[PDB]
Amino acid sequence: ESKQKIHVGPGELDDYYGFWSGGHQGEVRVLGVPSMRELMRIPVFNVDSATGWGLTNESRHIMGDSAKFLNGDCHHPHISMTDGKYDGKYLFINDKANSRVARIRLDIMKCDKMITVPNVQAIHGLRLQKVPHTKYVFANAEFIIPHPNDGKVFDLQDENSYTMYNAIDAETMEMAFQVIVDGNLDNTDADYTGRFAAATCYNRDWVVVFDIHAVEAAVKAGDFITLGDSKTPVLDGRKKDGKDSKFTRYVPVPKNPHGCNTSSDGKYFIAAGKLSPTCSMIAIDKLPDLFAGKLADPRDVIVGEPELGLGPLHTTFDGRGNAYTTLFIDSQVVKWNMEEAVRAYKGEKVNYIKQKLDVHYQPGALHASLCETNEADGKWLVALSKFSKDRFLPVGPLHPENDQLIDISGDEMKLVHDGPTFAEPHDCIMARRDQIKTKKIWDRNDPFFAPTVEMAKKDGINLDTDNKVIRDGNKVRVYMTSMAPAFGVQEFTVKQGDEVTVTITNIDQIEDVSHGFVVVNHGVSMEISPQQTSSITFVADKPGLHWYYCSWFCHALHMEMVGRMMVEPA
Amino acid sequence: QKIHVGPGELDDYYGFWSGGHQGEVRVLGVPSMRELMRIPVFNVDSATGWGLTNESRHIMGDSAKFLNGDCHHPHISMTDGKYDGKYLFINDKANSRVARIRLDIMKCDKMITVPNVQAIHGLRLQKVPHTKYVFANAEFIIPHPNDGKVFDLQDENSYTMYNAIDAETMEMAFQVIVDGNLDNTDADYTGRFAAATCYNSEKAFDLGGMMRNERDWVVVFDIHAVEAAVKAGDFITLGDSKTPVLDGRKKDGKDSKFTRYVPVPKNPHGCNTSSDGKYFIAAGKLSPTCSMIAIDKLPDLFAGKLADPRDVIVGEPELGLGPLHTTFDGRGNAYTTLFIDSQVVKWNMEEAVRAYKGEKVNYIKQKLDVHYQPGALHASLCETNEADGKWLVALSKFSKDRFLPVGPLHPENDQLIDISGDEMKLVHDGPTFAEPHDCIMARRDQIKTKKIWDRNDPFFAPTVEMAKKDGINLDTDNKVIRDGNKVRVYMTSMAPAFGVQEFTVKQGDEVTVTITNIDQIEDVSHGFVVVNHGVSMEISPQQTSSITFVADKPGLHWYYCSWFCHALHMEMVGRMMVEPAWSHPQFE
Ligand code: CUA
Ligand code: CUA
Ligand SMILES: [Ca+2]
Ligand SMILES: [Cl-]
Ligand SMILES: [Cl-]
Ligand code: NA
Ligand code: NA
């Protein structure tokens, strides 16, 4: 019987971390599960006034040139794995809007790396290699574009118009390789060996299967081209006059397949039918024979095609042998047994459908706890539905997404909580509490602000102790420690037009004692947590006295942790 | 009392949360404490395009160049001392602004940078006869003018000001120079009086200086006197602002017509009007008390019928260490946060008053442990004469171990407390991001929202005017207007298709895309994102939205609808073709 506790009362703690995509708002969100409360916001592609992400020098360095963009469009959060189990190291997420992949360090809960994927448009589907560990992040670029895209050729049917499958080195966050494909890429997942990955494609469509070992072999042998000014190795996984690449096989699957999900037992890539009221089950164990040319037809790797309902979009797994698929049109989650569907495909009279649960309304993605791992525990399911209609109080023309928590621990799915969320997160990922280990206090050697430590060294500054103003032409570099309730530099004087950099090192050793730094009427704001160094650059374009203050309540005398910038007129 | 809202059940109250240092406003359901909406205000929102669209940047004015705000004090407009559900207002301490949110469309529709001040902190609204004025404190003393000739805070022209904004026009109404600085503020239930705590009577910049005086004060404003002086022309102006400026400073021990200074200990913080209209209650912070100012003794105070300003104090209950804010159940009880003792203390106001007169009575009813270091607190409808005594939210700054660890930065703990009975009962710990500080609740029936936009809504009326100059009917037209190096694309949109699915421009052209969502169905939002150009906005049913960007990259560039709107949503795409600069006339 499905009978888990859903109430986390005061003083009790949640059992799982939930990492939510920030949707069109561009951040990542940390929730407690089963309470479904938001514990933290992690800025990624958004500009965060609170912490200064997008304003500070540390964040803009990580964002690189893409720091000029104030927007992102997220869908697919995933956690790094070792031996097919979450290892708690990194979270990765896509940006469809400006074609990026971001990495979040789960010990500090900050974005620490970001890459603009070269020569593509719109990074949408994203999942991680599972085995032996997450060596690659796999990222779909959705839209076909000309190559080069220099304005001479606009024809999307041109032989050099295509999109590409993208592999990013998870640890260095540099491109590993790109594979040109036929069609548009939708979603993607990886097997439990490291050899295979797959993606659904549109524009009978197909699942494209990648022999990653073959791609890697060709990269090591130098058998690749490069595109534009990117050194990324580029392999051609397209068909040519009906001849296959060594890198890809195209498996025909009903029109416009959508979700592409690897079962936790490693047996299946499951492509959701969308327009077809079905899912197609690709047997991963038959893929070696497919690439060796031992099979008669690419369709032979299909071992199941359960008929489930109207509008199947995504599938997840309880680790007990059941799959759970969203039905967008029927507005349900359908629970079905995978091995029984396989036997049905062979012609046996067996009902593989176990239950349909109405959800509210029009579900897109769904996620069961630990479903992307061989430890899928079958305890919780989140279905993320697009049209909340009357499930929450009206709040004007815009509506929240309805992310519904479902107890799947027993034979019967039970709906237990409706969670409204902002800007359509689309998908989420859960981890056991003991799978995530966070720092309470920053390490002074942390790579996040290591470039700022290096700049301080060029100025002769010991960030742990010093309170000094460095003059350098029209550049002014203030360095200070902060200890509640006092800034280490409480006043400084500059010339109108000077470019001011303020570097603050929080030397409080008490956990949870955050400081802020805001320069009034200059658009300057940032947070500095214990033992962190943060810095921000602005031009003092207004003569006169200009106050700065600590924004984060840190002390009974917080309101008086302030300072003065005096700007002498030109 | 209903604590938990199950699937298909609805919340009983709207909660409007300050977005803290993050700069937005958040709409919550109460008592579930789930977030139903975010309303962008001083932040740049990728999802809806606030801060990127022409409509939002027009509202923000020149302050659209800032990507940050710092919010604390959300309040709802009132008619005859009851919420009327028309507007919400909130402060920006970071760039010295006040913003207005229209509660029917749940959008910020007006914003003002308060002139000649720094840091808008305390904010509350006139209650009676209605919210004519928004009252806003500027916290920091600055020179006037602030041209960089004088930096001395002790100069006779260094001061801060109390600010009145016309709530309906969102233009400045007046400013009152005060002594000291300004912390928090509230208004009475007659329209005559407002009041503000001051923590820096010493006009210092260092911590010890700001703490020297045994008592600072709460300054009381005679708004009737201020209005009379404005109407009489007895005022000055500062710089190029035409806002009437009145001097509410003392000059050699003689009061102005506009103010009275009530001595109150010490670095007082909260300034809360009781829901029965009897008291301004100032929280003592460094003094373990609150001071109770009898509003009905204030006319006598300004009329010289009292010998000492302290004569308007009729209670000073000792409550605990670090009183910060007070709220009211409408049953005669006040609830005050104790930041150091980490508690909410429930106490009876009329009994505190009797104790001040010497009558030994125990006005303290209950002390509830909160977790940890509470700042502001808010009981449902507490700023109105309808204070219903049902729910209390105490917003604590250090959540410590109350939630799962999430790294060095911790959430705020907003704790929901049942006060409908004699005993306060903690029912829910709510984690929030970037220290909201305070919130305001309203009954479900006090808020009425629109699901579909009116085509004449002032939010995008400037865009309609622009379209008209191009001869555009926004409800029908799908046209590309060319004007030199400017391109103005106008399109209707109806799920799952953009009305204009491709268009061609020259490299370097300034492209404005105006989209009118002509779907007439609730909750069919469209999006518009131009890939790799930093362009994103939302368009809700019957809304017109527009965004301007430079086509600086030759080649083909996809745009797509970001918001799920239709089963064929992923087909709602289009293409911008950018002809390269070397094929067009060359400039320098
Ligand atoms: Cu430092 Cu508040
Ligand atoms: Cu329009 Cu999705
Ligand atoms: Ca003082
Ligand atoms: Cl998927
Ligand atoms: Cl207050
Ligand atoms: Na990078
Ligand atoms: Na304005």
PDB file of C-alpha atoms in Angstrom, chain A residues 113-339:
ATOM      1  CA  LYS A 113      31.230  26.564 -15.263  1.00  0.00           C
ATOM      2  CA  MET A 114      29.294  27.535 -18.378  1.00  0.00           C
ATOM      3  CA  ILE A 115      29.851  26.861 -22.095  1.00  0.00           C
ATOM      4  CA  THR A 116      28.298  28.269 -25.260  1.00  0.00           C
ATOM      5  CA  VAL A 117      28.061  25.273 -27.600  1.00  0.00           C
ATOM      6  CA  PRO A 118      29.696  26.306 -30.904  1.00  0.00           C
ATOM      7  CA  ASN A 119      28.058  26.341 -34.335  1.00  0.00           C
ATOM      8  CA  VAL A 120      24.558  25.323 -33.149  1.00  0.00           C
ATOM      9  CA  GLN A 121      21.271  26.931 -32.181  1.00  0.00           C
ATOM     10  CA  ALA A 122      19.214  26.045 -29.077  1.00  0.00           C
ATOM     11  CA  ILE A 123      20.457  23.441 -26.603  1.00  0.00           C
ATOM     12  CA  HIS A 124      17.340  21.551 -25.516  1.00  0.00           C
ATOM     13  CA  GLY A 125      17.536  17.839 -24.650  1.00  0.00           C
ATOM     14  CA  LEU A 126      20.303  16.988 -22.178  1.00  0.00           C
ATOM     15  CA  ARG A 127      21.318  13.886 -20.196  1.00  0.00           C
ATOM     16  CA  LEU A 128      24.487  12.430 -18.726  1.00  0.00           C
ATOM     17  CA  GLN A 129      26.635   9.399 -19.401  1.00  0.00           C
ATOM     18  CA  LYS A 130      25.915   6.874 -16.614  1.00  0.00           C
ATOM     19  CA  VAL A 131      28.744   4.317 -16.767  1.00  0.00           C
ATOM     20  CA  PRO A 132      31.610   4.112 -15.873  1.00  0.00           C
ATOM     21  CA  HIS A 133      30.856   7.688 -14.785  1.00  0.00           C
ATOM     22  CA  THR A 134      29.650  10.977 -16.263  1.00  0.00           C
ATOM     23  CA  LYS A 135      32.579  11.594 -18.572  1.00  0.00           C
ATOM     24  CA  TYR A 136      30.318  13.315 -21.120  1.00  0.00           C
ATOM     25  CA  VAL A 137      27.346  15.605 -20.970  1.00  0.00           C
ATOM     26  CA  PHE A 138      25.177  14.858 -24.014  1.00  0.00           C
ATOM     27  CA  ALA A 139      23.275  17.853 -25.389  1.00  0.00           C
ATOM     28  CA  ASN A 140      20.861  18.136 -28.308  1.00  0.00           C
ATOM     29  CA  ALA A 141      20.913  21.230 -30.501  1.00  0.00           C
ATOM     30  CA  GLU A 142      17.342  21.490 -31.713  1.00  0.00           C
ATOM     31  CA  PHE A 143      17.327  23.701 -34.829  1.00  0.00           C
ATOM     32  CA  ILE A 144      18.806  23.015 -38.277  1.00  0.00           C
ATOM     33  CA  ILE A 145      21.034  25.894 -39.452  1.00  0.00           C
ATOM     34  CA  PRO A 146      23.386  26.535 -42.394  1.00  0.00           C
ATOM     35  CA  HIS A 147      27.110  25.792 -42.077  1.00  0.00           C
ATOM     36  CA  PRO A 148      28.597  28.257 -42.253  1.00  0.00           C
ATOM     37  CA  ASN A 149      25.790  30.553 -41.063  1.00  0.00           C
ATOM     38  CA  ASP A 150      27.287  33.652 -42.659  1.00  0.00           C
ATOM     39  CA  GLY A 151      24.265  34.914 -44.603  1.00  0.00           C
ATOM     40  CA  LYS A 152      25.117  33.538 -48.059  1.00  0.00           C
ATOM     41  CA  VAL A 153      22.934  30.413 -47.746  1.00  0.00           C
ATOM     42  CA  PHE A 154      19.572  30.486 -45.966  1.00  0.00           C
ATOM     43  CA  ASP A 155      18.264  27.193 -47.443  1.00  0.00           C
ATOM     44  CA  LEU A 156      17.445  24.662 -44.721  1.00  0.00           C
ATOM     45  CA  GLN A 157      17.480  21.890 -47.339  1.00  0.00           C
ATOM     46  CA  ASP A 158      21.055  22.733 -48.337  1.00  0.00           C
ATOM     47  CA  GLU A 159      23.506  19.857 -47.967  1.00  0.00           C
ATOM     48  CA  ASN A 160      25.378  21.931 -45.353  1.00  0.00           C
ATOM     49  CA  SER A 161      22.268  22.743 -43.325  1.00  0.00           C
ATOM     50  CA  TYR A 162      21.989  20.435 -40.312  1.00  0.00           C
ATOM     51  CA  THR A 163      22.113  20.286 -36.551  1.00  0.00           C
ATOM     52  CA  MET A 164      24.460  18.299 -34.332  1.00  0.00           C
ATOM     53  CA  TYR A 165      24.590  16.090 -31.261  1.00  0.00           C
ATOM     54  CA  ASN A 166      26.941  17.579 -28.669  1.00  0.00           C
ATOM     55  CA  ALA A 167      29.276  15.935 -26.151  1.00  0.00           C
ATOM     56  CA  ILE A 168      30.797  18.170 -23.475  1.00  0.00           C
ATOM     57  CA  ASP A 169      33.576  16.980 -21.189  1.00  0.00           C
ATOM     58  CA  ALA A 170      31.792  17.061 -17.808  1.00  0.00           C
ATOM     59  CA  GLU A 171      34.947  17.707 -15.802  1.00  0.00           C
ATOM     60  CA  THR A 172      36.683  20.339 -17.921  1.00  0.00           C
ATOM     61  CA  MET A 173      33.451  21.811 -19.379  1.00  0.00           C
ATOM     62  CA  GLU A 174      35.077  22.010 -22.806  1.00  0.00           C
ATOM     63  CA  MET A 175      33.559  20.454 -25.922  1.00  0.00           C
ATOM     64  CA  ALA A 176      34.515  16.808 -26.483  1.00  0.00           C
ATOM     65  CA  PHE A 177      32.978  16.257 -29.933  1.00  0.00           C
ATOM     66  CA  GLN A 178      29.966  16.949 -32.143  1.00  0.00           C
ATOM     67  CA  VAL A 179      28.084  14.530 -34.410  1.00  0.00           C
ATOM     68  CA  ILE A 180      26.142  15.807 -37.419  1.00  0.00           C
ATOM     69  CA  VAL A 181      22.763  14.047 -37.689  1.00  0.00           C
ATOM     70  CA  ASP A 182      19.787  13.921 -40.021  1.00  0.00           C
ATOM     71  CA  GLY A 183      16.698  15.693 -38.721  1.00  0.00           C
ATOM     72  CA  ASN A 184      15.942  17.751 -35.620  1.00  0.00           C
ATOM     73  CA  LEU A 185      17.026  16.474 -32.209  1.00  0.00           C
ATOM     74  CA  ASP A 186      14.470  16.333 -29.398  1.00  0.00           C
ATOM     75  CA  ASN A 187      15.451  14.363 -26.243  1.00  0.00           C
ATOM     76  CA  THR A 188      18.369  12.112 -25.343  1.00  0.00           C
ATOM     77  CA  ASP A 189      19.599   9.521 -22.834  1.00  0.00           C
ATOM     78  CA  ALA A 190      22.519   7.134 -22.343  1.00  0.00           C
ATOM     79  CA  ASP A 191      22.888   3.427 -21.610  1.00  0.00           C
ATOM     80  CA  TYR A 192      24.524   1.724 -18.606  1.00  0.00           C
ATOM     81  CA  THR A 193      27.846   0.869 -20.288  1.00  0.00           C
ATOM     82  CA  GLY A 194      29.213   4.031 -21.852  1.00  0.00           C
ATOM     83  CA  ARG A 195      29.077   2.651 -25.369  1.00  0.00           C
ATOM     84  CA  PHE A 196      25.655   3.899 -26.496  1.00  0.00           C
ATOM     85  CA  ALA A 197      23.511   7.004 -26.416  1.00  0.00           C
ATOM     86  CA  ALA A 198      20.279   7.757 -28.210  1.00  0.00           C
ATOM     87  CA  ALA A 199      18.104  10.704 -29.198  1.00  0.00           C
ATOM     88  CA  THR A 200      14.634  11.118 -30.623  1.00  0.00           C
ATOM     89  CA  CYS A 201      14.451  13.034 -33.914  1.00  0.00           C
ATOM     90  CA  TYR A 202      11.734  14.778 -35.934  1.00  0.00           C
ATOM     91  CA  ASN A 203      11.509  16.153 -39.532  1.00  0.00           C
ATOM     92  CA  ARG A 204       7.987   7.618 -39.550  1.00  0.00           C
ATOM     93  CA  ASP A 205      10.764   9.525 -37.808  1.00  0.00           C
ATOM     94  CA  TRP A 206      13.475   7.871 -35.739  1.00  0.00           C
ATOM     95  CA  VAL A 207      15.591   7.379 -32.679  1.00  0.00           C
ATOM     96  CA  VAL A 208      19.223   7.995 -33.658  1.00  0.00           C
ATOM     97  CA  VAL A 209      21.654   5.726 -31.801  1.00  0.00           C
ATOM     98  CA  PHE A 210      25.261   6.837 -31.312  1.00  0.00           C
ATOM     99  CA  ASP A 211      28.166   4.411 -30.968  1.00  0.00           C
ATOM    100  CA  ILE A 212      30.179   6.634 -28.635  1.00  0.00           C
ATOM    101  CA  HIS A 213      33.100   4.164 -28.711  1.00  0.00           C
ATOM    102  CA  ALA A 214      33.232   4.525 -32.505  1.00  0.00           C
ATOM    103  CA  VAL A 215      33.143   8.330 -32.225  1.00  0.00           C
ATOM    104  CA  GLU A 216      35.915   8.268 -29.627  1.00  0.00           C
ATOM    105  CA  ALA A 217      38.005   5.954 -31.821  1.00  0.00           C
ATOM    106  CA  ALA A 218      37.720   8.380 -34.747  1.00  0.00           C
ATOM    107  CA  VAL A 219      38.658  11.360 -32.555  1.00  0.00           C
ATOM    108  CA  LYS A 220      41.787   9.579 -31.286  1.00  0.00           C
ATOM    109  CA  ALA A 221      42.748   8.699 -34.886  1.00  0.00           C
ATOM    110  CA  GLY A 222      42.224  12.289 -36.033  1.00  0.00           C
ATOM    111  CA  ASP A 223      39.446  11.328 -38.466  1.00  0.00           C
ATOM    112  CA  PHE A 224      37.301  14.441 -38.042  1.00  0.00           C
ATOM    113  CA  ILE A 225      36.789  17.951 -39.397  1.00  0.00           C
ATOM    114  CA  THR A 226      36.281  21.231 -37.568  1.00  0.00           C
ATOM    115  CA  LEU A 227      33.715  23.957 -38.229  1.00  0.00           C
ATOM    116  CA  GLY A 228      34.305  27.690 -38.229  1.00  0.00           C
ATOM    117  CA  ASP A 229      36.697  28.924 -35.556  1.00  0.00           C
ATOM    118  CA  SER A 230      35.937  26.054 -33.153  1.00  0.00           C
ATOM    119  CA  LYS A 231      38.535  23.351 -32.566  1.00  0.00           C
ATOM    120  CA  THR A 232      35.756  20.898 -31.614  1.00  0.00           C
ATOM    121  CA  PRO A 233      36.141  17.568 -33.483  1.00  0.00           C
ATOM    122  CA  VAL A 234      33.136  17.134 -35.788  1.00  0.00           C
ATOM    123  CA  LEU A 235      32.005  13.716 -37.004  1.00  0.00           C
ATOM    124  CA  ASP A 236      29.426  13.063 -39.701  1.00  0.00           C
ATOM    125  CA  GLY A 237      26.641  10.799 -38.414  1.00  0.00           C
ATOM    126  CA  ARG A 238      24.345  11.470 -41.372  1.00  0.00           C
ATOM    127  CA  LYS A 239      23.251   8.835 -43.846  1.00  0.00           C
ATOM    128  CA  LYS A 240      24.785   9.218 -47.314  1.00  0.00           C
ATOM    129  CA  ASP A 241      22.892   7.731 -50.266  1.00  0.00           C
ATOM    130  CA  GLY A 242      21.396   5.199 -47.866  1.00  0.00           C
ATOM    131  CA  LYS A 243      24.784   4.222 -46.391  1.00  0.00           C
ATOM    132  CA  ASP A 244      25.229   4.344 -42.632  1.00  0.00           C
ATOM    133  CA  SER A 245      27.920   6.103 -40.679  1.00  0.00           C
ATOM    134  CA  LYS A 246      30.087   4.094 -38.323  1.00  0.00           C
ATOM    135  CA  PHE A 247      28.792   6.504 -35.686  1.00  0.00           C
ATOM    136  CA  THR A 248      25.015   6.267 -35.980  1.00  0.00           C
ATOM    137  CA  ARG A 249      22.058   4.037 -36.731  1.00  0.00           C
ATOM    138  CA  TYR A 250      18.586   5.425 -37.389  1.00  0.00           C
ATOM    139  CA  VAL A 251      15.806   3.340 -35.806  1.00  0.00           C
ATOM    140  CA  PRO A 252      12.375   4.075 -37.362  1.00  0.00           C
ATOM    141  CA  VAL A 253       9.845   5.079 -34.712  1.00  0.00           C
ATOM    142  CA  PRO A 254       6.314   6.553 -35.143  1.00  0.00           C
ATOM    143  CA  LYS A 255       5.958  10.215 -36.179  1.00  0.00           C
ATOM    144  CA  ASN A 256       7.502  12.922 -33.996  1.00  0.00           C
ATOM    145  CA  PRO A 257       8.693  10.818 -31.035  1.00  0.00           C
ATOM    146  CA  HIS A 258       9.361  12.893 -27.971  1.00  0.00           C
ATOM    147  CA  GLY A 259      10.789  11.632 -24.675  1.00  0.00           C
ATOM    148  CA  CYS A 260      13.838   9.378 -24.801  1.00  0.00           C
ATOM    149  CA  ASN A 261      14.312   7.544 -21.494  1.00  0.00           C
ATOM    150  CA  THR A 262      16.670   4.756 -20.376  1.00  0.00           C
ATOM    151  CA  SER A 263      15.075   2.169 -18.097  1.00  0.00           C
ATOM    152  CA  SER A 264      16.865   1.783 -14.763  1.00  0.00           C
ATOM    153  CA  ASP A 265      17.608  -1.904 -15.491  1.00  0.00           C
ATOM    154  CA  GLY A 266      19.572  -0.757 -18.521  1.00  0.00           C
ATOM    155  CA  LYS A 267      17.437  -2.815 -20.893  1.00  0.00           C
ATOM    156  CA  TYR A 268      15.635  -0.134 -22.937  1.00  0.00           C
ATOM    157  CA  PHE A 269      15.754   3.200 -24.627  1.00  0.00           C
ATOM    158  CA  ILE A 270      12.061   4.143 -24.506  1.00  0.00           C
ATOM    159  CA  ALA A 271      10.842   6.735 -26.998  1.00  0.00           C
ATOM    160  CA  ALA A 272       7.439   8.245 -26.269  1.00  0.00           C
ATOM    161  CA  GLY A 273       5.072   8.327 -29.220  1.00  0.00           C
ATOM    162  CA  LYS A 274       3.443  11.779 -28.808  1.00  0.00           C
ATOM    163  CA  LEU A 275       1.346  11.635 -32.001  1.00  0.00           C
ATOM    164  CA  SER A 276       1.390   7.835 -31.789  1.00  0.00           C
ATOM    165  CA  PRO A 277      -0.515   6.607 -28.679  1.00  0.00           C
ATOM    166  CA  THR A 278       2.466   4.365 -27.952  1.00  0.00           C
ATOM    167  CA  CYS A 279       5.980   4.119 -26.649  1.00  0.00           C
ATOM    168  CA  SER A 280       8.652   2.286 -28.645  1.00  0.00           C
ATOM    169  CA  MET A 281      11.085   0.114 -26.688  1.00  0.00           C
ATOM    170  CA  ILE A 282      14.611  -0.239 -28.129  1.00  0.00           C
ATOM    171  CA  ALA A 283      16.540  -3.229 -26.749  1.00  0.00           C
ATOM    172  CA  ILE A 284      19.972  -1.895 -25.818  1.00  0.00           C
ATOM    173  CA  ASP A 285      21.394  -5.434 -25.815  1.00  0.00           C
ATOM    174  CA  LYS A 286      20.589  -5.716 -29.540  1.00  0.00           C
ATOM    175  CA  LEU A 287      22.481  -2.519 -30.413  1.00  0.00           C
ATOM    176  CA  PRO A 288      25.905  -4.204 -30.816  1.00  0.00           C
ATOM    177  CA  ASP A 289      24.396  -6.549 -33.423  1.00  0.00           C
ATOM    178  CA  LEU A 290      22.770  -3.551 -35.116  1.00  0.00           C
ATOM    179  CA  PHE A 291      26.098  -1.740 -35.535  1.00  0.00           C
ATOM    180  CA  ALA A 292      27.933  -4.940 -36.518  1.00  0.00           C
ATOM    181  CA  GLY A 293      25.505  -5.364 -39.426  1.00  0.00           C
ATOM    182  CA  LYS A 294      24.143  -8.615 -37.992  1.00  0.00           C
ATOM    183  CA  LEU A 295      20.469  -7.515 -38.057  1.00  0.00           C
ATOM    184  CA  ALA A 296      18.157  -7.448 -41.057  1.00  0.00           C
ATOM    185  CA  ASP A 297      16.364  -4.156 -40.368  1.00  0.00           C
ATOM    186  CA  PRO A 298      16.939  -1.311 -37.870  1.00  0.00           C
ATOM    187  CA  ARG A 299      13.371  -2.065 -36.714  1.00  0.00           C
ATOM    188  CA  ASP A 300      14.605  -5.386 -35.291  1.00  0.00           C
ATOM    189  CA  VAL A 301      15.968  -3.616 -32.197  1.00  0.00           C
ATOM    190  CA  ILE A 302      12.373  -2.627 -31.346  1.00  0.00           C
ATOM    191  CA  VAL A 303      11.122  -5.168 -28.816  1.00  0.00           C
ATOM    192  CA  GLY A 304       7.981  -3.411 -27.591  1.00  0.00           C
ATOM    193  CA  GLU A 305       5.387  -0.849 -28.606  1.00  0.00           C
ATOM    194  CA  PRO A 306       2.783  -0.672 -25.819  1.00  0.00           C
ATOM    195  CA  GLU A 307      -0.455   1.150 -26.587  1.00  0.00           C
ATOM    196  CA  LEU A 308      -0.928   3.437 -23.600  1.00  0.00           C
ATOM    197  CA  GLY A 309      -3.174   6.423 -24.331  1.00  0.00           C
ATOM    198  CA  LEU A 310      -3.359   9.775 -26.061  1.00  0.00           C
ATOM    199  CA  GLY A 311      -0.211  11.900 -26.191  1.00  0.00           C
ATOM    200  CA  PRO A 312       2.645   9.975 -24.529  1.00  0.00           C
ATOM    201  CA  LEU A 313       5.441  12.427 -23.835  1.00  0.00           C
ATOM    202  CA  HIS A 314       7.962  11.146 -21.244  1.00  0.00           C
ATOM    203  CA  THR A 315       8.621   7.961 -19.252  1.00  0.00           C
ATOM    204  CA  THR A 316      10.175   7.183 -15.852  1.00  0.00           C
ATOM    205  CA  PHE A 317      10.789   4.091 -13.744  1.00  0.00           C
ATOM    206  CA  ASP A 318      10.148   2.784 -10.236  1.00  0.00           C
ATOM    207  CA  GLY A 319      12.939   0.200 -10.357  1.00  0.00           C
ATOM    208  CA  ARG A 320      10.353  -2.536  -9.748  1.00  0.00           C
ATOM    209  CA  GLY A 321       9.874  -3.190 -13.472  1.00  0.00           C
ATOM    210  CA  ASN A 322       7.179  -0.610 -14.117  1.00  0.00           C
ATOM    211  CA  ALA A 323       7.343   2.381 -16.392  1.00  0.00           C
ATOM    212  CA  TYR A 324       5.288   5.546 -15.827  1.00  0.00           C
ATOM    213  CA  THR A 325       4.403   7.649 -18.876  1.00  0.00           C
ATOM    214  CA  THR A 326       2.711  11.033 -19.139  1.00  0.00           C
ATOM    215  CA  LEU A 327      -0.333  11.211 -21.404  1.00  0.00           C
ATOM    216  CA  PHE A 328      -0.593  14.850 -22.452  1.00  0.00           C
ATOM    217  CA  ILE A 329      -4.003  14.624 -24.150  1.00  0.00           C
ATOM    218  CA  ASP A 330      -5.680  12.134 -21.801  1.00  0.00           C
ATOM    219  CA  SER A 331      -4.069  14.163 -18.945  1.00  0.00           C
ATOM    220  CA  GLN A 332      -2.885  11.134 -16.983  1.00  0.00           C
ATOM    221  CA  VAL A 333       0.132   9.177 -15.806  1.00  0.00           C
ATOM    222  CA  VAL A 334      -0.066   5.563 -17.002  1.00  0.00           C
ATOM    223  CA  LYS A 335       1.796   2.853 -15.072  1.00  0.00           C
ATOM    224  CA  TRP A 336       2.780  -0.179 -17.144  1.00  0.00           C
ATOM    225  CA  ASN A 337       5.035  -3.226 -16.793  1.00  0.00           C
ATOM    226  CA  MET A 338       7.867  -3.252 -19.318  1.00  0.00           C
ATOM    227  CA  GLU A 339       8.489  -6.972 -19.606  1.00  0.00           C
TER     228      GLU A 339
END
